Structure formats: structure tokens, C-alpha cells
Amino acid sequence: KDIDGRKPLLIGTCIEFPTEKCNKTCIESNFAGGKCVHIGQSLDFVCVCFPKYYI
């Protein structure tokens, strides 16, 4: 897998899209799924997907 895949996609805040939905939403988006993580020190959870077919 020589795919760099370095373009995460934010859909919403983990508030509206918890861990379960977050990833599921990312799956249908054609991404390697997603998760809930904090930003720098904003302690704000967000749903971000990962590249999979980005060539």
C-alpha cells in the first residue's frame, strides 16, 4: 500500500456523531472509517474519517 492517504475528512462533532455512528458514517463515505479525537488542546471531540481510495 503505497497510498499516502493523508487527507482526513471532518463530518461533524462527536456530539452529533458518536464513535459508533462516526465511523459508520465514514465507512459509507468511502473512507477507512473514522473516530472521535481531540484537537491540540481544545479538548473538543470531532468525527474525522481516513483516506482509503485516495490515489
Q: How far is CA 43 from CA 14, 18, 28, 36, 47, in A?
A: 12, 15, 27, 11, 13
Say how many residues make up the chain: 55
Which experimental approach was used here?
NMR
Domains identified in the chain, total number: 1
Q: Where are the alpha helices (DSSP H) in the chain?
A: 19-28
Residue 19 lies in domain: 1-55
Residue 17: exposed, middle, or buried by beta-carbon count in 10 A (0-12, 13-18, 19+)? buried
Strands lying side by side in the sheet with 9-13: 9-13, 46-49, 34-37
Q: What values do phi and psi take at 15, rounded to 5?
A: -70, -45
C-alpha cell at 38: 481531540
The residue among 19, 27, 20 whose CA lies nearest residue 50 is 27
DSSP strands (E only) in 1-55? 9-13, 34-37, 46-49
Q: How many beta carbons lie within 10 A of that of residue 41, not counting itself?
A: 6
